[PDB]
From a paper:
In rod-PEG-ub we find—for several instances of well-isolated regions of the spectrum—three peaks per residue. Owing to the higher spectral complexity arising from the three non-equivalent molecules, we did not assign the spectra of rod-PEG-ub. This correlation between NMR 15N R1ρ relaxation data and XRD resolution is further substantiated by the third crystal form, rod-PEG-ub, which displays lower 15N R1ρ rates, suggesting that rocking motions are of low amplitude (blue bars in Fig. 3b). Clearly, the rocking motion found in the MD simulation of cubic-PEG-ub (order parameters 0.982 and 0.957 for chains A and B, respectively) is much more pronounced than for MPD-ub and rod-PEG-ub (average order parameter 0.995 for both systems). A direct influence on rocking of the precipitating agent used for crystallization can be excluded on the basis that both cubic-PEG-ub and rod-PEG-ub crystals crystallize in essentially the same condition (sometimes even in the same crystallization drop).
We prepared three different crystal forms of the 8-kDa globular protein [name]. These crystals are henceforth referred to as MPD-ub, cubic-PEG-ub and rod-PEG-ub, reflecting the different precipitation agents (methyl-pentanediol (MPD) and polyethylene glycol (PEG), respectively) and the morphology of the crystals. We have shown here that three independent and complementary techniques, NMR, MD and XRD, all provide evidence for an overall rocking motion in protein crystals.
Author numbering: 1 to 70
């Protein structure tokens, strides 16, 4: 599935991911795109703070969803 991640600058990155992907996995993908270290990445989805060991599906993250780096 496809999701979007908004960096702190409003930049939009596109990610190809799976429902069982962990935030840590996503976090790894963001690092590759922008060079942003995972430990400095904080992801939020629909007002929910996302934990590294949980999956996208665990947060009801669906196709075309948008995540925010904070
Ligand atoms: Zn897909
Ligand atoms: Zn994956």
């Amino acid at each position: 599935m496809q999701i979007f991640v908004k960096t702190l600058t409003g930049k939009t990155i596109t990610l190809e991911v799976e429902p069982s992907d962990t935030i840590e996995n996503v976090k790894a993908k963001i690092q590759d795109k922008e060079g942003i270290p995972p430990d400095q990445q904080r992801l939020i989805f629909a007002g929910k703070q996302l934990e590294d060991g949980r999956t996208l599906s665990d947060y009801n993250i669906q196709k075309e969803s948008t995540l925010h780096l904070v």
